[PDB]
Ligand binder design. Structure first.
Ligand SMILES: *[C@H](O)[C@H](C[C@@H]1CCNC1=O)NC(=O)[C@H](CC1CCCCC1)NC(=O)[C@@H](NC(=O)OC(C)C)[C@@H](C)OC(C)(C)C
Ligand SMILES: *[C@H](O)[C@H](C[C@@H]1CCNC1=O)NC(=O)[C@H](CC1CCCCC1)NC(=O)[C@@H](NC(=O)OC(C)C)[C@@H](C)OC(C)(C)C
Lengths: 306, 306
């Protein structure tokens, strides 16, 4: 038993990370087959950053301007191309450690593991969610650009995130692996702000089920509630609406515990109305929203990868 | 910026995990060079578990009783030997993925990353601490025995923990990689209990410094306190004594923030006396004790491995 913020094992991604250096800028690249993916602002500098124009900037670069290093072995760039906000550097060597992989653009509320990297060397691994405002509450220092977010599904790495920037509020923004930003952010140095965030209600519900699977029952009640009446209370506390699709997704968790989803909603309602009154749930004194229903099933039941 | 429970990248350990099967029992082994390490109760069964006697049990086994599988390639056991509570199975093949490594027995309060495994396949990675009562608050299901805990120091994997058992309270107990249990636990099925736990005070202090490094300052005060007077308040709230050695270890964190350690102690004192009053620190509504002073420096400054 027990419940932990669990990231996926990171070995299949460690084997893909490289350092990319152009001009005065060093960041992280993702080496898959014979292509290295990285954020396109690597072709910027300190005065290119104001209001860039990357097409003009990229036509001025030669292949030998990109220094790409995999270990103490640095690769030869034989071509480049821009796709939205990512560079794709063609190198003369295929990565022999290329896992089976996909590129996926995830929905808000979905979770993924982040392998934080500096100078092409992995630093640490942790679990994050795409917030409803399309930021992520990461842990990123200078030079972490190019670190990726990913899920693992049997032996396939689904890459879902590349890191670009930190916002004044301390949260983080980036792109899918095809260069499209999550959210309304753009890769300029102009005032941008996150936009109001909300709590991922389906995830809270999923974590209460995790609590019940692990032996916490103190917050349950006899009451129930309708979906409209739950949503009327969730709105007041800045929670997202729960859709019938969310209810369905929470089916297995309901069926395994014997607590109807609408009954767990009545529990959350009273939890939001009265606070936790100095108790904890799964070691937390706040209602936790960065576990998906899939996360709970995986950890409380024990799915692996090979 | 930002602050996260960060585990070490797990690739160098994923490459060592194997499945070990003997009789009706399947658990996880650690393959380093030509030896596979695993918990010795793999030679038990459902009636061997009552009050075992592993010397007698082990002299009755032949090498071909141990089925050891690394991928869809299973190894040949050519010898075995017991060392405290771990089996060391000699195999005819050296693991080509053996990292540079050490075996270290850690102190309470120290943290490490756990690679949870089933049937030799890594499942997920997370960060834990050795509690003052020598248990760990892990996340472990049946078949997770043999999963290891580790730190990484440049390119050297310091293995510090092998998983053996869960206790009635839901916490977890195991050994160092030489088979010595942490704590007073033994590998029998007899009533054992954890013993009262305490909060790791130096770690709390270290995490408040993490908070200040990241922009939280609301909990600081002008007051200060002596070490005796801090320890008199910590005792009342079930915190461990803070030694001068702890103060020294918190030197760099003090020097980087301009907050004397004894001043941060006065902050914690008021935090313990008045609660947090509905505020959070680094996203937590409880004082967090599973970050060491080294953990904070690593994450807030950005040390890697290669
Ligand atoms: C790349 O490694 C780096 C990662 C950040 C540094 C600190 N934490 C990070 O996550 N990204 C940047 O430094 C980035 C540079 C590019 C320049 C051209 C395209 C935009 C990003 N700059 C930032 O993240 C800055 N944020 C920013 O300008 O956001 C505006 C307001 C929308 C950071 C470094 O500045 C602070 C002051 C921290 C907000
Ligand atoms: C090995 O994979 C497994 C891991 C635990 C199963 C569930 N969670 C775990 O971490 N370890 C065991 O199942 C272990 C078997 C051996 C048998 C001989 C030596 C002792 C351990 N048994 C337990 O962990 C049980 N705990 C236990 O007997 O502790 C006593 C009270 C000291 C667990 C499975 O039983 C419960 C009811 C969960 C406490």
């Amino acid at each position: 038993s027990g419940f932990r913020k669990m990231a996926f094992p990171s070995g299949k991604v460690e084997g893909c990370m490289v350092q990319v250096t152009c001009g005065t800028t060093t960041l992280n690249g993702l080496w898959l087959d014979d292509v290295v993916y990285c954020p396109r602002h690597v072709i910027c500098t300190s005065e290119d950053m104001l209001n860039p124009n990357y097409e003009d900037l990229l036509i001025r670069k030669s292949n030998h301007n990109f220094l790409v290093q995999a270990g103490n072995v640095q690769l030869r760039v034989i071509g480049h191309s821009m796709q939205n906000c990512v560079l794709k550097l063609k190198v003369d060597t295929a990565n022999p450690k290329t896992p089976k992989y996909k590129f996926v653009r995830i929905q808000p509320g979905q979770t993924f593991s982040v392998l934080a990297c500096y100078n092409g060397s992995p630093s640490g691994v942790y679990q994050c969610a795409m917030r409803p405002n399309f930021t992520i509450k990461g842990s990123f220092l200078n030079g972490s650009c190019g670190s990726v977010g990913f899920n693992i599904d049997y032996d396939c790495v689904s890459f879902c995130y590349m890191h670009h920037m930190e916002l004044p509020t301390g949260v983080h923004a980036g792109t899918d692996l095809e260069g499209n930003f999550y959210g309304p952010f753009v890769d300029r140095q102009t005032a941008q702000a996150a936009g109001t965030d909300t709590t991922i209600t389906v995830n809270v519900l999923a974590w209460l089920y995790a609590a019940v699977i692990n032996g916490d029952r103190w917050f349950l009640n006899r009451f129930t509630t309708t979906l409209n009446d739950f949503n009327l209370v969730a709105m007041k506390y800045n929670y997202e609406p729960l859709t019938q699709d969310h209810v369905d997704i929470l089916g297995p968790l309901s069926a395994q515990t014997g607590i109807a989803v609408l009954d767990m909603c009545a529990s959350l309602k009273e939890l939001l109305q009265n606070g936790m009154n100095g108790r904890t749930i799964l070691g937390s004194a706040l209602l936790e929203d960065e576990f998906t229903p899939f996360d709970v099933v995986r950890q409380c039941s024990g799915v692996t990868f090979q």
